Design a protein around this ligand. Structure first.
Ligand SMILES: CC(=O)SCCNC(=O)CCNC(=O)[C@H](O)C(C)(C)COP(=O)(O)OP(=O)(O)OC[C@H]1O[C@@H](n2cnc3c(N)ncnc32)[C@H](O)[C@@H]1OP(=O)(O)O
Length: 181
């Protein structure tokens, strides 16, 4: 397989992406799936594909939310039969260089804990907020640990976002060398 920039003019790659998003997050992607993928094709954003044979085995994107300095990692999906084989790691690393070249300094993302897959859920997050964030533990293979192993740190939490004790975990990473103090 090869990871490279997404052919934004390939109708098949786009359909494959639409299918991948609908099979992974059907609650977020539905009938207007094609229109949502077209938004991911916007010139200002970055679109990186992981392709093997005739399949889109993975995809990653980033939106410039704060000028060209603050990018959001959205989305990131690997085919179910292709996970835990480093595609995600290679895709995130590829995105980081894409962002850096465009003047980006940091990439952030938000990953919710809806299935009680982290110790940050089912607990009053306003109580010892940051002591809890620090002592976090993965209970159900929650993707937060993935980003953590890639250098992203939990920089914030949104308590009770998806209902009682179901927070949104905010993670970020500065991709370029700090100009010192
Ligand atoms: C931006 C958003 O929408 S949030 C992103 C959430 N994405 C999803 O849940 C979609 C479905 N999942 C996937 O696409 C993938 O499993 C990803 C993107 C979460 C990870 O990609 P993969 O290629 O499967 O993981 P990769 O092989 O790079 O794993 C790298 C390391 O992180 C670990 N890791 C990967 N996924 C997870 C996870 N869900 N939970 C815990 N650890 C994980 C791996 O075990 C490995 O650790 P090791 O080096 O100690 O062995």
């Amino acid at each position: 397989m090869i990871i490279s920039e997404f052919d934004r003019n390939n109708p098949v790659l786009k359909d494959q992406l639409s299918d991948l998003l609908r099979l992974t997050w059907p609650e977020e992607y539905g009938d207007s799936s094609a229109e949502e993928v077209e938004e991911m094709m916007n010139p200002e954003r970055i679109a990186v594909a992981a392709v093997d044979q005739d399949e889109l085995v993975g995809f990653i994107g980033a939106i410039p939310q704060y000028g060209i300095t603050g990018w959001e990692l959205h989305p990131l999906v690997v085919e179910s039969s292709r996970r835990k084989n480093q595609i995600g790691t290679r895709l995130v690393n590829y995105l980081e260089k894409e962002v850096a070249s465009r003047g980006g300094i940091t990439i952030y993302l938000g990953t919710d804990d809806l299935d009680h897959g982290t110790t940050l859920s089912q607990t009053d997050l306003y109580e010892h907020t940051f002591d809890k964030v620090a002592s976090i533990q993965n209970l159900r293979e929650h993707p937060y640990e993935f980003y953590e192993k890639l250098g992203y740190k939990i920089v914030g939490v949104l308590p009770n976002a998806n209902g009682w004790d179901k927070p949104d975990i905010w993670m970020a990473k500065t991709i370029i060398p700090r100009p010192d103090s």
